[PDB]
Ligand binder design. Structure first.
Ligand SMILES: [Pt+2]
Ligand SMILES: [Pt+2]
Lengths: 110, 110
């Protein structure tokens, strides 16, 4: 199905409150300090995004730890974490696991 | 089809010589200075890998420039570039374009 269908089914299932902006980007907060953005690009890629605060900028950024990989980047000089995967074949179960996995990773870093 | 089917069809089409090792990793050289490794992990992910020499380690590593993204990492303190995408939905045409695109990117950096 489309990104929104997936997104809806996702939040409507996990009973989590969400926030969609004008550009069609979903946001969900973990506890009270973790914000995760989820957008779809070019009708194929699902992007995850979350800020890290003032984490250890020294990250080798190799693939292997996660599938897909969690990449640490520099935005506004400020540390961020992102993950991407194609929509094709993406089921609600994989979506949930990927998120949990990304959420988990965020905490361990912050 | 499987990774190998794809891989074969790829090299057998572009008329490029290749080299498969013991771990089932394909290698292809561009001109005489560019080596690209292609492996499949967990029967789902196709990984691209190539060394950069002594490039500018200062890379923000944001998504957006390419789909999928070309990530710059540190392996053995030495700069590398990688890209990953799921096998599902992956056709020989996308494979070729992704490679060309990765190859291109390597050159511009080295
Ligand atoms: Pt597009
Ligand atoms: Pt596996």
């Amino acid at each position: 199905t489309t990104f929104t269908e997936l997104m809806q089914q996702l939040f409507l299932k996990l009973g989590l409150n969400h926030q969609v902006n004008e550009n069609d980007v979903y946001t969900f907060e973990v506890d009270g300090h973790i914000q995760v953005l989820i957008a779809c690009y070019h009708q194929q890629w699902v992007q995850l995004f979350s800020e890290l605060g003032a984490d250890l900028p020294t990250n080798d950024n190799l693939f292997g730890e996660h599938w897909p990989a969690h990449v640490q980047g520099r935005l506004d000089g400020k540390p961020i974490l992102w993950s991407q995967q194609s929509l094709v074949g993406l089921d609600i179960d994989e979506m949930q696991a990927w998120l949990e996995r990304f959420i988990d990773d965020i905490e361990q870093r912050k």
